């Protein structure tokens, strides 16, 4: 049981979602045209969670690809293993969003989202017990903010009680693509703290310095960008896709990640980060990988964990190792660096492990946890939102589609309330 339907909505969601199934099909040994190539119940038991078994042995991924562009999703049509999905899981959009939040909701969203909900209904027929949904999108995209915010609200009319695990690609504080990026980031999050429970923060432009300095890449691109993001996506859904002693599904992850439901912005990441030549000349031990996730060199967002304080720490390891050394190593950091941890939690760092090795790396750990690192990033978004709205610059692009001046006022009051929500325990 506990089936999860995946919804890859947006331009940036399909680029991550193309390599998201490349890791699952390689670790489980699922043949794209055969039946399976597994070995035991570590890989063959959890096939029915993320795949629906057809008659004959062919496995179909529970994935819905939504995009308001024909040319973007054609790479996932007949490209890098994109012919394995259902033909009705390829909902195209002939009208582009144009990096506008108001166009994807009132113009494009009024005619497409009734058909996108039909694809979730057909996927839920093969789900004997629906656990929840995931949503990979972006804040600086038109379809990621248009078909990601309106899709997450209409899915609660049919699924009001099920959990949600959204994946949000945050914009970068270093470079900018357009001036409406503080507009699209403020409007998408303002309806995201309303009735959701999980949201990560991944910065793509911040990973260009990680590939240049650590992964030893001279000229990075979008193909080298999404490789280590897929390692972070597979690290969260490790115990969900592989059985083990530390059983923790998405239902157990929704409770033990947030003491409060509103402050649900996490900082994903993983470890280690080795290049293509210096990987074999490095040994990986238990205190080596456990002490690398706390530093600033293993962050997926442009943040600084050296000036913050965490609330809940969860880590999933890869490989048969002694997990009693993880708790004893992290407890010694909580006594000497108690200003970075919680004072009333005796076991801040949670433990998770599996018996399936990853691709390429021998041992690997991932970092899932919230802190005050999102608080300093939410101030820069509201700072750019304040200067643009006070001059009322480019408001006719939004108010001409169905918005108003009071819509941005309520979107500014509650987003600055989230800044004071993180400012209490800082």
């Amino acid at each position: 049981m506990r089936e999860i339907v995946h919804i890859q909505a947006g331009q940036c969601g399909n680029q991550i979602g193309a390599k998201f199934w490349e890791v699952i099909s390689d670790e489980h040994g699922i043949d794209p045209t055969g039946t399976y190539h597994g070995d035991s119940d570590l890989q063959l038991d959890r096939i029915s969670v993320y795949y629906n078994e057809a008659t004959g042995g062919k496995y179909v991924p529970r994935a819905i690809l939504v995009d308001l562009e024909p040319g973007t999703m054609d790479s996932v049509r007949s490209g890098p293993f994109g012919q394995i999905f259902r033909p009705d899981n390829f909902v195209f959009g002939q009208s582009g969003a144009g990096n506008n939040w108001a166009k994807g909701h009132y113009t494009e969203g009024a005619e497409l989202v009734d058909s996108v909900l039909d694809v979730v209904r057909k996927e839920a027929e093969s789900c004997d017990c629906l656990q929840g949904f995931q949503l990979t999108h972006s804040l600086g995209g038109g379809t990621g903010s248009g078909m990601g915010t309106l899709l997450i609200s209409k899915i609660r009319e049919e699924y009001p009680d099920r959990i949600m695990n959204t994946f949000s690609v945050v914009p970068s504080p270093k470079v900018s693509d357009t001036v409406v990026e503080p507009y699209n980031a403020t409007l998408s999050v303002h309806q995201l703290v309303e009735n959701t429970d999980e949201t990560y923060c991944i910065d793509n432009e911040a990973l260009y310095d990680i590939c240049f300095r650590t992964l030893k890449l001279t000229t990075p691109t979008y193909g080298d960008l999404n490789h280590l993001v897929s390692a972070t996506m597979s690290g969260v859904t490790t115990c969900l896709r592989f059985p083990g002693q530390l059983n923790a599904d998405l239902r157990k992850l929704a409770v033990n990640m947030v003491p409060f439901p509103r402050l649900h912005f996490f900082m994903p990441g993983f470890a280690p980060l080795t290049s293509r030549g210096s990987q074999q000349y490095r040994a990986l031990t238990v205190p080596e990988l456990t002490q690398q996730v706390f530093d600033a060199k293993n962050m997926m967002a442009a943040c600084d964990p050296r000036h913050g304080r965490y609330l809940t720490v969860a880590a999933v390891f890869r490989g048969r190792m002694s997990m009693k050394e993880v708790d004893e190593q992290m407890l010694n950091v909580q006594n000497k660096n108690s200003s970075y941890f919680v004072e009333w939690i005796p076991n801040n760092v949670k433990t998770a492990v599996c018996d399936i090795p990853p691709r390429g790396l021998k041992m690997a750990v991932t970092f899932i946890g919230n802190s005050t690192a999102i608080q300093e990033l939410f101030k820069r978004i509201s700072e750019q939102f304040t200067a643009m709205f006070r001059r009322k610059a480019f408001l006719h692009w939004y108010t001409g589609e169905g918005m108003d001046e009071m819509e941005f006022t309520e979107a500014e009051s509650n987003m600055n309330d989230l800044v004071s929500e993180y400012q209490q325990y800082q």
Binding site: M1, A54, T55, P70, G71, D74, R77, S78, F90, F92, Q94, L117, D118, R121, K122, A124, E125, C127, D128, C129, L130, E157, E158, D161, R251, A254, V255
Partner: protein, 525 residues
């Protein structure tokens, strides 16, 4: 130019330059879309970037799925979007009027005149064209034989006249048994399902509903006669509390007591269903079908299968609206007031599997007021031909029921309207004398395109049609078989009143605004 000085990367078009951009682009959309107007039009195969075939010739699907990047083509595509949104047909004829309102006006603006003088003649010609349209409409009290000829005209122009005899019986008989006593007919009560069973000429009209999901348990009955429909909105699957609670137990004997107790609230919903089957005199067959919009766990599916209750799951939003009218029950959201008054009735509930995909059929209702057109096209692209023609035909008969009058057919409206503007051409008494002439010649493209697609002559046909109209009083039209002028009101070729009314209003305003554009430019970078 002034825009080149401020922004060096900003293109511009001047007064005599921007007029040639909009007119030559309107001729580009006119010369493409004129090959599909009427029954003698040709099919267009539209291939996207993926490689799928979209074989259709409707004017709205042609303009949207066309690789064109032009600002003039985006204005006509938005007017063509609203023509296929509120009234169905009238999209191909929409673009051909705009293609002639800018081409006939170019003969005067380039010959010294101002574009505003032509737009003043379009408003004076629209006032006479609106008054003449109310004099040619025929009220026939919405007879069921009249609606056949209305649906036959809209269906022939999208199929090869072998399926038009089949789809007319599936469109007219579907639109009559929805609403009565002067009620607006809701088109959401008709379900359109795509099948692959027999052939394209096998689309039938199911009197009930066809659900695209089947039973999710192998022990359930596949064919159920004399069933009771119990429409539910509750969630029979396992749900947790909103507050994160979890369990705490001491021994292993108390572990199995918590699994039995956590399903007690789930089984209390199932016990309300199996006790309703015992209160409807279950000493017979007495089939029970639960559609159940929200999901059901396999624990409750195993409990309902032992009693003999077919239980579906994951229904649509409008399935609780169409089946509620068809079965006559009450779509409940709780099991606190279960009664036989909220139950439905169907004479036959059966399923059928088409390539590991079940389809639940519900038939034999008394007064359903909700039907389903079962399209069984062989290919994937042939399903898009019938679905785009059914909604073109359903919106045609919906306008003929709401409006009390019927408008005549092919050339019985456009030729008679153009002759009425010639006798009222000296009535303007000013410089706008040539504006009524440009509007009257633009309305004559509908007999010109229909005479061109049928293979006949263009100018020789329009002489004989205008001769029979000037020497008689009957609204004569175009015959696409012989070329002789034939009356459209007698041969059974009709049209909608709201289509011809909006063709005189949406095309005229979008032509007077395009002719008053002289500064096409691209700035903002």
């Amino acid at each position: 130019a002034a825009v080149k000085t401020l922004n060096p990367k900003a293109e511009v078009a001047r007064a005599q330059a921007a007029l040639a951009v909009n007119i030559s682009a309107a001729r580009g959309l006119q010369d493409v879309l004129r090959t599909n107007l009427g029954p003698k039009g040709t099919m267009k195969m539209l291939v996207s970037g993926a490689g799928d075939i979209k074989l259709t010739k409707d004017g709205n699907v042609l303009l949207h799925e066309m690789q064109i990047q032009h600002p003039t083509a985006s204005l006509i595509a938005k007017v063509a979007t609203a023509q296929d949104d509120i009234t169905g047909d009238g999209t191909t004829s929409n673009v051909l009027i705009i293609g002639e309102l800018l081409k006939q006006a170019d003969l005067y603006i380039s010959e010294g005149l101002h574009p505003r003088i032509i737009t003043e003649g379009f408003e004076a010609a629209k006032e006479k064209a609106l008054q003449f349209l109310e004099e040619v409409k025929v009220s026939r009290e919405m007879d069921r034989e009249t609606l056949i000829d209305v649906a036959r005209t809209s269906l022939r122009t999208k199929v090869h006249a072998e399926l038009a005899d089949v789809l007319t019986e599936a469109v007219v008989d579907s639109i009559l048994a929805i609403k009565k006593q002067d009620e607006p007919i809701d088109l959401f009560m008709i379900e359109i399902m795509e099948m692959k069973h027999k052939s394209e000429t096998d689309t039938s009209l199911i009197r009930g509903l066809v659900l695209d999901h089947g039973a999710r348990h192998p022990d359930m009955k596949k064919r159920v006669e004399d069933a009771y429909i119990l429409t539910c909105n509750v969630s029979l699957e396992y749900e947790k509390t909103e507050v994160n609670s979890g369990f705490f137990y001491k021994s292993a004997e108390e572990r199995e007591k918590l699994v039995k107790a956590e399903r007690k609230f789930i089984e209390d919903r199932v016990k309300k269903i199996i006790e309703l089957k015992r209160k409807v005199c279950g000493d017979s067959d007495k089939g029970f079908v639960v559609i159940n919009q929200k999901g059901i766990d396999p624990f409750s599916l195993d409990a309902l299968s032992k009693e003999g209750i077919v239980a579906l799951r994951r229904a649509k939003r409008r399935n609780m609206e169409r089946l509620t009218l068809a079965c006559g029950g009450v779509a409940l959201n709780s099991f606190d007031d279960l009664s036989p008054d909220c139950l439905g009735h169907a004479g036959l509930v059966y399923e059928y599997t088409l390539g590991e995909e079940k389809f639940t059929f519900i038939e034999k209702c008394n007064n359903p007021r909700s039907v389903t057109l079962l399209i069984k096209g062989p290919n994937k692209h042939t399903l898009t031909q019938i679905k785009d023609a059914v909604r073109d035909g359903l919106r045609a008969v919906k306008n003929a029921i709401d409006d009390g009058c019927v408008v005549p057919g092919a050339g019985a409206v456009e030729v008679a309207m153009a002759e009425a503007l010639i006798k009222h051409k000296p009535s303007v008494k000013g410089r706008a004398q040539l504006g009524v002439q440009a509007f009257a010649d633009a309305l004559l493209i509908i007999p010109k395109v229909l005479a061109q697609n049928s293979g006949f002559d263009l100018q020789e046909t329009l002489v004989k049609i205008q001769a029979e109209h000037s020497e008689s009083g009957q609204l004569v039209g175009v015959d696409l078989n012989t070329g002789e002028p034939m009356v459209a009101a007698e041969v059974g070729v009709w049209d909608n009143y709201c289509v011809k009314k909006q063709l005189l209003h949406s095309c005229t305003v979008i032509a007077t605004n395009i002719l008053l554009v002289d500064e096409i430019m691209r700035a903002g970078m």
